[model samples]
Structure formats: structure tokens, C-alpha cells
Target: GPGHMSASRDDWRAARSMHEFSAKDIDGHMVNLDKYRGFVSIVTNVASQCGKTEVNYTQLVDLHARYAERGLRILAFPSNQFGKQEPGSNEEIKEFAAGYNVKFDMFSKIEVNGDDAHPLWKWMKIQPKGKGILGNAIKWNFTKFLIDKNGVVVKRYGPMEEPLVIEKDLPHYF
Candidate 1:
């Protein structure tokens, strides 16, 4: 019964805007999304066990190195909804990302689907381009939502889409 709601359904309308949300970081610290108000954000659901993990992680790291000074921030959220791909504790996830020398922010594990999904994720699903071929279900890990400096969701990329593909769109926000 919980999954009965349609992805097409916009349940996140109650929230005034994307800036009005917060999530726990890998260290269990509360991070207010508003803190990144002036920076463009790439919010993605990640899983280390996914087949596309390495490349996606690498590209994300590269993206961070490239545009971080230009007001870009990558916010990664680990999710296990698909295939139970992320089966580690918060500390483990932190260690895994750290192993890659990732400098961006990595949040705690979260559900990107179903009733218990995070509000920010629920809101993302209804944003401009947050839906994928499977609507807002988030087909797999690496589903990314690009938000502008003003907290507008500008585009959404599926798992197979590399982070490099986002380069062309960065200038518009920067």
C-alpha cells in the first residue's frame, strides 16, 4: 500500500522550497541544505556496490575538483533500495568514499523510494527534471538532480549518464 502513490503525484508540494530541508552527513551531523544556497548542487543517490560505482565516483570527484571553486557542491546520498547495493554502515560508507579521495559531501544512508523516502528526495522527484524513464522511481543508483544556486532543480540524469555530461550545463549556473 505504501508504494501505491504515483511518481507523477506531487506530494512534496507542502515544502516551500528545496532550501527548507536538512539531512545527516556521513558523520551523523545535521547539514542544512540552505548552507549551500549560493552554490549549485548536484544531489545524487549513490551505492558503492553498483556496477557503475567506480566511474561515477571518479567522475563525481573530478567534477568536484573542477567546479568546486566555481560555486558547485556535490551532495551524495547512499541508498540501498535497489538490489541492496549499499549494505554498509555510515562509517563504512564514509571510509569507502574517502578511499576514493572524494572531497565533496557524503550523507548518511537513505531510501529514495517508498513511504520512508527522505523529504528532499520526495521533493526532488517532482522537480523540473527529477523524473527518469521510470518516472520518479529513481531507476538505479547514480540518479542525479542538478539544482541551481537559487534552489531550483534544473535537470536530472540517470545512472548511465556520466558526470562529465553535466559540464555543458555548468556555465549556465556559474
Candidate 2:
């Protein structure tokens, strides 16, 4: 059974070609997922009301600043699925991020876990390293998935891990 489930850990690089998805920004503006094509993308399930909110926000900003010129973009989606941690309207979350000088993209809330979770996330959870909690569910707030230029989810890190930890691996090499 485990083997069967893990079999779905498909090579996303192959499937990513022209794969298009859509969602709304915090301001309700429609965003075409295809727009991020060819860029190294970081997708994060974020929460404004969570305890790690500010810290994560700042670190994310730093992450963006450090990598944006190299084709990296951090795309955050506020989600309320965990502990009802992100209850503010998208506008409020956007403002909070702006106050912290977040220059990346932050989208409206979405369910990062459950049947209602976004398809992008569903696919993300199927990456090879998507195991451990694969076919299961997210454990808490600030879950992050790092996708590479080929659109493959290269890694998934938990909230406890600092965003700066990725700096070295994802092209900010020391």
C-alpha cells in the first residue's frame, strides 16, 4: 500500500510543461499560475494570525530579496485551514506584509490541507520528497514547498525551519 501511494510521486518536471492553474491575489485579482513559468518558485501556505507570522514574513522578504534577481519568486497563500490562524481579509494580510517590506506575492487564503485544498498543493504533496506526511495532511501553519525552475517541487520544509536555511541550497550558494 505504501509503495502504491508513493508511486504517485511523479516527476513533476515532465508534467509541468504548460500546466496552468489559477487563483486570486489578496486583493481579489485573478492570477494565472502560468505567469510564474520558468522562474524558481517557492509556494508557502501562510497565515497572518499565527505566532510565526511576522518572523516568517520578514524571512520570506529576505528570501525574495536575496534570490529574486536570480529568477526566484516567493509566492505565499494565506490559509485558514490550520487552527483558524489566518482570519483577516486578504487586504489586511497584504497590508501587514507591506508594512514589513515584503516584495513578493501573497495571495488570498486557501485550504492547504483537506479535500478542498488547491490542486497546485495537491500536486505538490505528490512530489518524491512529499513523503513523511504524504497522503496525510499538513500538521500546522507556515508549511512551505520549494519548486524549481523546471516546476518540480525540489523540497518541502516545515514552519520550524527558518527560510534562510534555503538560501544556500536554492542558488544563494555559499
Candidate 3:
């Protein structure tokens, strides 16, 4: 039977099996996506100096605590691509997130726009849902990519969208 855009298992599985990438946290610790296989991950590019940094952090931490029991993970990648908001070194960024309400993983600072965008982000841009602002480039800070247990880019969310919105989609994947 054909499936609706809101729920397509075959498309979801195809996206979940993409190659994982090697990244680092703000502490310089390695972050291999493979470790998150079999878990639904909410990946977003964060920024400390940005206006929305605090809001994104608080909301993400809340989302994590709310869903961790369901095998959901939140991957926070600090990026300076927008307004030089994340201008700190890996260690500094780590300290910042550590002090904040964030309880999820904080990856090393990386580009999420322009030519030097991270590989994971580059691949995320190709998702069918990646069209619109999410398709052209990471329009701004907090751009999120949702990956199912299989690691496919199931959804691309603009930073302006609230975490609650993504929460609405969790059931379909489960």
C-alpha cells in the first residue's frame, strides 16, 4: 500500500542507512554517528553567541529528558556559520554548554553553511524534505535534521520551529 508523506516506512528506512561521519565534541572527543545507530536522533546546529542559543539549549535539554527513555538522542553541533555566534574553541564551547541547561551531546564547532559545511550536514541537505530553506543551505542557526534509527534524514526542521513540533512526529517513526 502507498504511504502518506507524514508516514512512509520504506522511505524512512532508506534514509536511515546512510554512511555515518566522524566528528568531535567541543572537548575534542570523537563523535561517530555509528554509536547512535538504532536510536532516533534529533541533530541540530547550535550557537552560543546567537540570540536563540539559550532558547535552543533549554528546549533541547527538555526534549532529551522527555524522550531519552524511548531511545531518542539529541546531537547538538555548535556552528559559527550564522553571525559568528559560536566563536569559541572546542573547549570553550564545551564549557558553555556544560554550564547551560543542555544535557545532550555537544559536538565541536563546525560550519553549517557556505562551502565548508560539515559532511553530515552536506548529506542532510539532500533529503527530499530538505527542500525549501533547508535545501539551499542551512538558512540560520538551529537548523535541525531528524534521523531515524537507520540514520536517514527523515526530516529537516528550521530553527524557528519549536521542539514540540518535532515531538509530534516521533510516534510515526516508532
Candidate topping lDDT: 1
lDDT of 1 at 48: 78
For candidate 1, report its TM-score: 0.86
lDDT of 1: 0.81
Per-prediction RMSD in angstroms? 7.4, 7.1, 7.6
* Residue-wise C-alpha lDDT for candidate 1, range 63-83, written one tens digit per residue: 788887898888888988888
Off by over 4 Å in 2: 1-19, 133-135, 172-174
Once superposed on the true structure, which residue ranges of model 3 sit more than 4 Å away at CA? 1-19, 133-135
Candidate 3: the clashing residue pairs are 15-152, 16-150, 16-151, 16-152
TM-score of 2: 0.82
User: lDDT for every model?
Assistant: 0.81, 0.72, 0.73
lDDT of 3: 0.73
Candidate 3 structure, TM-score to reference: 0.80
Q: Per-residue lDDT of 1-174 in model 2, one digit per residue for the tens?
A: 445433444455445521446778887787887866788877777776787778777887887887777787777887777777877767788887888897776687456677888767766665565556435666677877777777666778887766877776787321
- The sequence of per-residue lDDT tens digits that candidate 3 reaches over residues 81-151 is 67777777777777787787677767775566778777667667766766554337767888778888787
